Amino acid sequence: IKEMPQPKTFGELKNLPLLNTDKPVQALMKIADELGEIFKFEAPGRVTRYLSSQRLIKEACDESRFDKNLSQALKFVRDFAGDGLATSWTHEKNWKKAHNILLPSFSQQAMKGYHAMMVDIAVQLVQKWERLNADEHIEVPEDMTRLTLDTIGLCGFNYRFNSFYRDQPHPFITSMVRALDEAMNKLQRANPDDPNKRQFQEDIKVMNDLVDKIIADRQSDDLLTHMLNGKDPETGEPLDDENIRYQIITFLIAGHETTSGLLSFALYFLVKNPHVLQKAAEEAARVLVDPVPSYKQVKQLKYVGMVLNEALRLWPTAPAFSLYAKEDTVLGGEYPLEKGDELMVLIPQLHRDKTIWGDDVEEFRPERFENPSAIPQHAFKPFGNGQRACIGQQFALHEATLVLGMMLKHFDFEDHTNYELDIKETLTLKPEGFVVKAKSKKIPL
Amino acid sequence: KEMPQPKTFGELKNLPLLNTDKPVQALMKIADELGEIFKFEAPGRVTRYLSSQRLIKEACDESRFDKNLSQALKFVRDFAGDGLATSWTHEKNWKKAHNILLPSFSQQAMKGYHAMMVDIAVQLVQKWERLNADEHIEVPEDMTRLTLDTIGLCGFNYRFNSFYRDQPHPFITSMVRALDEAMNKLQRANPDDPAYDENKRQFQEDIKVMNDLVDKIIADRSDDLLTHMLNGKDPETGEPLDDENIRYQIITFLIAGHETTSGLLSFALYFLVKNPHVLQKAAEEAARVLVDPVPSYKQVKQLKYVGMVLNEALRLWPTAPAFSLYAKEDTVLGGEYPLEKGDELMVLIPQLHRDKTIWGDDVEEFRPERFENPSAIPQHAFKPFGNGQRACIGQQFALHEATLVLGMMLKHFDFEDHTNYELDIKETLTLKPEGFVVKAKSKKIPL
Ligand code: HEM
Ligand code: HEM
Ligand SMILES: O=C(CCCCCn1ccnc1)N[C@@H](Cc1ccccc1)C(=O)O
Ligand SMILES: O=C(CCCCCn1ccnc1)N[C@@H](Cc1ccccc1)C(=O)O
């Protein structure tokens, strides 16, 4: 066997105070840098093991040996997302049922149907930036969140959040950050039930109000249509009212936060790497020859897609997923695991494995993705694994390629503050305070 | 726009322009005169030769264009069948063999090949260490010895033992005379004339001799290329390759796995001895990195400047000089040249690599520093390994072998261009510098 490294401990609290930080993922990456491809992490009543090497993670992604686990973060999310797709166990009846019902909503016939509504929101973004005065700047993650929230609202539910008509974020968004802030605070409390609880219940209510409005309002053929009318071929059943509500909550959050982070990181890397920005902008100008992009044109933005994958390599905006051992098994030939033992896949560290990518892992080089065939299996996992992989991957990448393509077509960008990367962590990653200036190329829509 | 076209010969159209020993260089001269695109007609065929990055970047759009079998590849297909290089993308055996063989070029596999590449590379170094004073090196001959032995050993655990022979193996000589016959046949108006019965008989003998080698390799039969051919299963269909296609893959990899790589090493050494400042910089890297008696896999990955030398040699003289494409549907090229579904294109790689709007005015100068940063190179400007899903499956194999061998050469010898060699590019289906010779003075560093 092989004894597993473990970071510094705090008495009876074990490793738990290491998570008492604003940037826990980045703290865990630093621990992985020090301890290597695997380390144990203990809290009162919990043990897990953080994996960082492709060698171990490829075994963890073997679905015959490991299944998706609900991390403590996902168990928190489950308090309001229920048995929606992202917070259900694979063995719960409603996972496979909703999976079968909703997977056609992300087929290529479906993406072609969403395209016009994605363009609707993208044009609003371009128009906002065209209308800024001289020396005004862009708050990048803020505007990317406006775009991605509006896109999932419109494409999925025919609901307009109208985020570009607001200077502050919507009630939904603000409350959910406070609930998450509270959730993380309660983790470090020895006696949580000591006479805070009320606000979380209030936050669960704001989201239910938007969900009822979306349902009552609903001829359309979008995500909500399939939720309300689709039947699972296996059970022959449609989703029930309770699970539909959970899916709406699930897709409103999962359908925009990570995609906003991706667009924000991609633009960050472009302005920090002018050779790459020039190459991406040349593609956008050459391919996007019409006032609004067509579906087929977006599919031709190969280098823009490479930029997005390389941004996901360095800063995968959903930074981890969790697994449990289905039976007793031995990991890597050296770490015996018992049935039910948990693993965490630390995606940013996997993506920095020098034995896979070479020694220059910290450099932003979209050309790594010029030939998809050259990447080993399970080396690149920003969308999770297997049957529990991200159902919205094609949606996110089509939206982000379209929008980044239009951004590069219509503006020159300046890193006017020489922005120093500052990664704020919710359950996802984004570059806090990232601002740029955009000079219009004066190309009409 | 009306497409330029070179001079014609009546009903023979442009075909007599290819009746030359150096057709690629003839086509480059035509491209120099006519520009980024020209029509080329023969009896029963029309194609268009592209030379600018502006047009070739569109041709590399896989939604609009797919790999075409040129007449040269149709010739190779007479004995390479539906192997990887001569199959159409839509033939079942292309994707099937692609999925089965791609793991044979993963980095776990390359680490497995490294020791066998070192085996052959040491034989090269020892041959040159053992030359007497004032003896010289026949460069393309020894590079072909090395690359043939390397693909034989790494791919099939078969030793050609080329360093034990003063003349090439029979199949190599067999290969070229078959090609010579094929290229003569282009010019024949009546190929089924009885006057060419003798020519056909010899072609079949050649296909037999190469096939005799394949039988020997299979009869002999590790975790190598042939292992995957015989045991791998395509994840999509769940099927292994059948015996007939395996034979075609062996033929394919025996040829594709060594000829272009020998040309690359030969051109790289040519450019180094013609550019002493570059040679000194590469030799300094080799001395700094290769600190052990034999290079490690990791050390080869660290020969950064040597890798740039190889890419710059591929820029000026890409040893696979062209590839062919066809339009998947009606489309317009460059906004001005309308194409119909099925219309064919030829990508003239040496001319693409001389596009002054991409590389600057010094395109003919050998400057490996052009390749310091791949992000600084425009998209589709550099295509020595083809394009897209039909790009060279052996690219990393070729570059690892050539970097290892060139690194060891630079570590162990000083080189002299003692004849002031005048570049003379011999054309098969690939390019190589004929008659290139050097003298090597050992630095007396043991292995
Ligand atoms: C760049 C953007 C995105 C990233 C990086 C991302 C990442 C991920 C990851 C890593 C998982 C697996 C999590 C786990 O195993 O616990 C996942 C699952 C999921 N994602 Fe995404 N996602 C993105 C965009 C989207 C979009 C646009 C949607 C909806 C339109 C979406 C909806 C979902 C859902 C429903 C699941 C759960 C799937 C299931 O278990 O059946 N995501 N995502
Ligand atoms: C410097 C050395 C090399 C060069 C310049 C080169 C060049 C090329 C080019 C341009 C193509 C595409 C041809 C077309 O589109 O018709 C190609 C394909 C191919 N090459 Fe290479 N090659 C080299 C080394 C190798 C090696 C070492 C191997 C085998 C170990 C190999 C095997 C193949 C195969 C099998 C294909 C067909 C791939 C497919 O269509 O699936 N080549 N090569
Ligand atoms: O590491 C992480 C971050 C994972 C969140 C990703 C969420 N996502 C998925 C798709 N889109 C977002 N989380 C651990 C922390 C912990 C470890 C031990 C003990 C207590 C807490 C956990 O939640 O269990
Ligand atoms: O230009 C070429 C040379 C291409 C050879 C590439 C061979 N290779 C590929 C991978 N490794 C080697 N070939 C044309 C010539 C022709 C044009 C018009 C009419 C008749 C013949 C053709 O073969 O079609």
CSV table of C-alpha atoms and ligand atoms in Angstrom, one decimal, chain A residues 19 28 41 43 46 50 71-73 318 320 344 427, ligand 3:
chain,number,residue,atom,x,y,z
A,19,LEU,CA,-11.7,25.9,4.0
A,28,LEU,CA,-6.7,23.4,-2.4
A,41,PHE,CA,-8.8,15.9,3.7
A,43,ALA,CA,-13.5,17.2,8.7
A,46,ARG,CA,-16.2,13.4,6.8
A,50,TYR,CA,-8.5,15.2,-3.5
A,71,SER,CA,-20.4,16.9,-2.3
A,72,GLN,CA,-21.3,19.1,0.7
A,73,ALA,CA,-21.6,22.0,-1.7
A,318,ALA,CA,-17.0,24.5,-12.2
A,320,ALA,CA,-14.5,20.2,-9.0
A,344,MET,CA,-12.8,14.9,-5.2
A,427,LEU,CA,-19.3,27.6,-6.1
C,3,LIG,O1,-14.2,21.1,-2.9
C,3,LIG,C1,-15.3,21.5,-3.1
C,3,LIG,C2,-15.9,22.4,-4.3
C,3,LIG,C3,-17.0,21.7,-5.3
C,3,LIG,C4,-18.2,22.5,-6.0
C,3,LIG,C5,-18.6,22.5,-7.5
C,3,LIG,C6,-20.1,22.8,-8.0
C,3,LIG,N1,-20.7,22.9,-9.4
C,3,LIG,C7,-21.0,21.8,-10.2
C,3,LIG,C8,-21.4,22.3,-11.4
C,3,LIG,N2,-21.5,23.6,-11.3
C,3,LIG,C9,-21.1,23.9,-10.1
C,3,LIG,N3,-16.2,21.1,-2.1
C,3,LIG,C10,-16.0,20.3,-1.0
C,3,LIG,C11,-15.5,21.0,0.3
C,3,LIG,C12,-15.5,20.2,1.5
C,3,LIG,C13,-14.6,19.2,1.7
C,3,LIG,C14,-14.6,18.4,2.8
C,3,LIG,C15,-15.5,18.7,3.8
C,3,LIG,C16,-16.3,19.8,3.7
C,3,LIG,C17,-16.4,20.5,2.6
C,3,LIG,C18,-17.4,19.8,-0.6
C,3,LIG,O2,-18.4,20.5,-1.0
C,3,LIG,O3,-17.6,18.7,-0.1
